[PDB]
Write an enzyme that holds these catalytic residues in place. Structure first.
Site, PDB file in Angstrom:
ATOM      1  N   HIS B  41      50.940 -14.303 -53.885  1.00 49.00           N
ATOM      2  CA  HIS B  41      51.059 -13.048 -54.615  1.00 49.00           C
ATOM      3  C   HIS B  41      49.901 -12.075 -54.293  1.00 49.00           C
ATOM      4  O   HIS B  41      49.930 -10.963 -54.789  1.00 49.00           O
ATOM      5  CB  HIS B  41      51.281 -13.233 -56.130  1.00 49.00           C
ATOM      6  CG  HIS B  41      50.079 -13.683 -56.896  1.00 49.00           C
ATOM      7  ND1 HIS B  41      50.008 -14.954 -57.440  1.00 49.00           N
ATOM      8  CD2 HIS B  41      48.955 -13.005 -57.222  1.00 49.00           C
ATOM      9  CE1 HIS B  41      48.850 -15.007 -58.074  1.00 49.00           C
ATOM     10  NE2 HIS B  41      48.174 -13.862 -57.952  1.00 49.00           N
ATOM     11  N   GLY B 143      41.739 -11.910 -61.455  1.00 53.29           N
ATOM     12  CA  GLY B 143      40.859 -12.153 -60.317  1.00 53.29           C
ATOM     13  C   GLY B 143      40.596 -13.627 -60.052  1.00 53.29           C
ATOM     14  O   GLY B 143      40.090 -13.987 -58.985  1.00 53.29           O
ATOM     15  N   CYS B 145      42.844 -15.981 -59.697  1.00 56.70           N
ATOM     16  CA  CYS B 145      43.863 -16.606 -58.860  1.00 56.70           C
ATOM     17  C   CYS B 145      43.290 -17.098 -57.543  1.00 56.70           C
ATOM     18  O   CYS B 145      42.397 -16.453 -56.978  1.00 56.70           O
ATOM     19  CB  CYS B 145      45.057 -15.679 -58.657  1.00 56.70           C
ATOM     20  SG  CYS B 145      45.849 -15.177 -60.205  1.00 56.70           S
TER      21      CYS B 145
HETATM   22  C1  LIG Z   1      48.781 -11.094 -62.029  1.00 57.03           C
HETATM   23  C2  LIG Z   1      48.901 -12.619 -61.931  1.00 57.03           C
HETATM   24  C3  LIG Z   1      48.326 -13.373 -63.134  1.00 57.03           C
HETATM   25  O1  LIG Z   1      49.047 -14.004 -63.905  1.00 57.03           O
HETATM   26  N1  LIG Z   1      46.972 -13.322 -63.258  1.00 57.03           N
HETATM   27  C4  LIG Z   1      46.190 -14.011 -64.216  1.00 57.03           C
HETATM   28  C5  LIG Z   1      45.896 -15.360 -64.046  1.00 57.03           C
HETATM   29  N2  LIG Z   1      45.145 -16.056 -64.903  1.00 57.03           N
HETATM   30  C6  LIG Z   1      44.658 -15.411 -65.969  1.00 57.03           C
HETATM   31  C7  LIG Z   1      44.890 -14.075 -66.243  1.00 57.03           C
HETATM   32  C8  LIG Z   1      45.677 -13.360 -65.351  1.00 57.03           C
HETATM   33  N3  LIG Z   1      45.956 -11.988 -65.640  1.00 57.03           N
HETATM   34  C9  LIG Z   1      47.127 -11.320 -65.474  1.00 57.03           C
HETATM   35  C10 LIG Z   1      46.950 -10.072 -66.000  1.00 57.03           C
HETATM   36  C11 LIG Z   1      45.635 -10.059 -66.458  1.00 57.03           C
HETATM   37  N4  LIG Z   1      45.013 -11.212 -66.245  1.00 57.03           N
HETATM   38  C12 LIG Z   1      50.352 -13.058 -61.765  1.00 57.03           C
HETATM   39  C13 LIG Z   1      51.363 -12.471 -62.519  1.00 57.03           C
HETATM   40  C14 LIG Z   1      52.655 -12.972 -62.480  1.00 57.03           C
HETATM   41  C15 LIG Z   1      52.961 -14.057 -61.676  1.00 57.03           C
HETATM   42  C16 LIG Z   1      51.961 -14.609 -60.901  1.00 57.03           C
HETATM   43 CL1  LIG Z   1      52.331 -15.953 -59.862  1.00 57.03          CL
HETATM   44  C17 LIG Z   1      50.669 -14.123 -60.930  1.00 57.03           C
END
Ligand SMILES: C[C@@H](C(=O)Nc1cnccc1-n1cccn1)c1cccc(Cl)c1
Ligand SMILES: C[C@@H](C(=O)Nc1cnccc1-n1cccn1)c1cccc(Cl)c1
EC number: 3.4.19.12
Lengths: 304, 304
Positions: B41, B143, B145
């Site tokens: 992603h 951040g 990820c």
């Molecule tokens: C944007 C990311 C995600 O979940 N990050 C994240 C990961 N861990 C903690 C917080 C976040 N935060 C997301 C918004 C603000 N923070 C994402 C969204 C949808 C699907 C997938 Cl595979 C990955």
């Protein structure tokens, strides 16, 4: 989101861990620049620990008696000295992995990461607090002496603790890196009283703010309190009296959540008086005091 | 003595952390040999995450679009491929700090350490368990990820997890290092059901053995039970059914303490039916399930 008892990444400290052997005793040393720091009880036998005369025991030791090994390579000891309860072994080689570092004496209630080591090899890392009674509730077995506590800011490792002993109560005691014990402890195999411990109030409040930030809000109430009223409750439940300095340090969390510090105190007062009623806060069924206000801000913002 | 939620020393993993940027998105990558592993992603914009067509999004990207930085030095990307939900960026330089490593897919109930990172820089380390429902209750912000989960045996780092997303419930989901999600999760911004979670019975029992070893014995009783009887209680309290495989893995702890596994089950049965009555076990007011039987033996013996 999510809140964990997080330790600092231990890499900079792993690169400093060495094994120190003197006679029959082996423990951990910390190699920074051309000096190896270790507990002075490395010079004692089991028979010596009841009432050791360290000055006399160290006099029978020469530079060649201190065997220092970093992984598989041996370090040449060219000097030895005792400073309080630590030995400083000057070696002919500066540690190439020496990070930027400071020696600091932490205050009770402050937190730090411990890199538990055996035979100069790291086994694990955990976050802990220096109790108000100057003990730590660590995880240390025989051979762990010389493992250190630290904090990391940017690229600087501030060493605050070196492990020396386990009290008969199973709690741990140690020194700053100048060999001064935290608390009234002496490095001898004798029963030693750790004073009455208290709960670190400012840290519990900081953790209540971390709970609200992460979604756990059930404990928030319609009440407020005063410093005086809250402190009468704190005294009853063996909590540290809260001061304006503590309130000021909680300023950033109060500003971030919009919950006045005295309003959060009223929540804590109700939790102390009624318990958790079988509920949890951030995965805990008790009031957590090992996260400082700076820890909460660091974890909730993502400081690397 | 003492029992702590201990993470592995993170040094070997810190040396592999890099920053990966693609367009506007920055996350963490893992540099092992001449390959950089990161969540796929990284190629999405915020608009793309509702229903991304990764194959189409990756087609618009070339090797020069993936900006990989290890500290202050830039890595040259000479190849790119997608394997499940991870991107593998071939670089022209093997990581000099690559430790001995394996990619492993852990089982639910198993534990691992997470090195939470931001912009390729480590912020902290914590121990956690893969829940029976294949989520983790971590501590991750925007951040984070690409931060990874691992275990270390001697000198070998077994990478088991890479962080991908936070569910609307605040729990975390991610993949093994071949990009396969643990659980039913997909890498898209959609509400996704994490199944009914259960408590990891074998880990709670392993932790009850750690309590006895460390002195907390108040919960030991005059009772015993059978696998069948205990499992009726486990079902009522949403605990994983205990099997003979679990009993066999508890063999070493049962042998060390002299407390038969079914006797310890009777203690757990009474704790489930009566609660802790305001008492604590190893500093916890709840039943801890994030320590496996191997973790308990490792911590209680001092494996480095
Ligand atoms: C944007 C990311 C995600 O979940 N990050 C994240 C990961 N861990 C903690 C917080 C976040 N935060 C997301 C918004 C603000 N923070 C994402 C969204 C949808 C699907 C997938 Cl595979 C990955
Ligand atoms: C021997 C050592 C010590 O307390 N070690 C230790 C440290 N931490 C955990 C366990 C131990 N274990 C001690 C026996 C078995 N293990 C000691 C004794 C008396 C005074 C001083 Cl300064 C240091």
């Amino acid at each position: 989101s999510g809140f964990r008892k997080m330790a600092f990444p231990s890499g900079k400290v792993e690169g400093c861990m060495v094994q120190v052997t003197c006679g029959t005793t082996t423990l951990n040393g910390l190699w920074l620049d051309d000096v190896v720091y270790c507990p002075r009880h490395v010079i004692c036998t089991s028979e010596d620990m009841l009432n050791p005369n360290y000055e006399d025991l160290l006099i029978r030791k020469s530079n060649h008696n201190f065997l220092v090994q970093a992984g598989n390579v041996q370090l040449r000891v060219i000097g030895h000295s005792m400073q309080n309860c630590v030995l400083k072994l000057k070696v002919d080689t500066a540690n190439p992995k020496t990070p930027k570092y400071k020696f600091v004496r932490i205050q009770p209630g402050q937190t730090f990461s411990v890199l538990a080591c055996y035979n100069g090899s790291p086994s694990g890392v955990y976050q802990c607090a220096m109790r108000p009674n100057f003990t730590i509730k660590g995880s240390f077995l025989n051979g762990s002496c010389g493992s250190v506590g630290f904090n990391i800011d940017y690229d600087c490792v501030s060493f605050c603790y070196m492990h020396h002993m386990e009290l008969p109560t199973g709690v741990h005691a140690g020194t700053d890196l100048e060999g001064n014990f935290y608390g009234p402890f002496v490095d001898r195999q004798t029963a030693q009283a750790a004073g009455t411990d208290t709960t670190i109030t400012v840290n519990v409040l900081a953790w209540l703010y971390a709970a609200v930030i992460n979604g756990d809000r059930w404990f928030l109430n319609r009440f407020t309190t005063t410093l005086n009223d809250f402190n009468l409750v704190a005294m009853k439940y063996n909590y540290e009296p809260l001061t304006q300095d503590h309130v000021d340090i909680l300023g950033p969390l109060s500003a971030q959540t919009g919950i006045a510090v005295l309003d959060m105190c009223a929540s804590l007062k109700e939790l102390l008086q009624n318990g958790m009623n079988g509920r949890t806060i951030l995965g805990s069924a008790l009031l957590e005091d090992e996260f400082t206000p700076f820890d909460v801000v660091r974890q909730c913002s993502g400081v690397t």
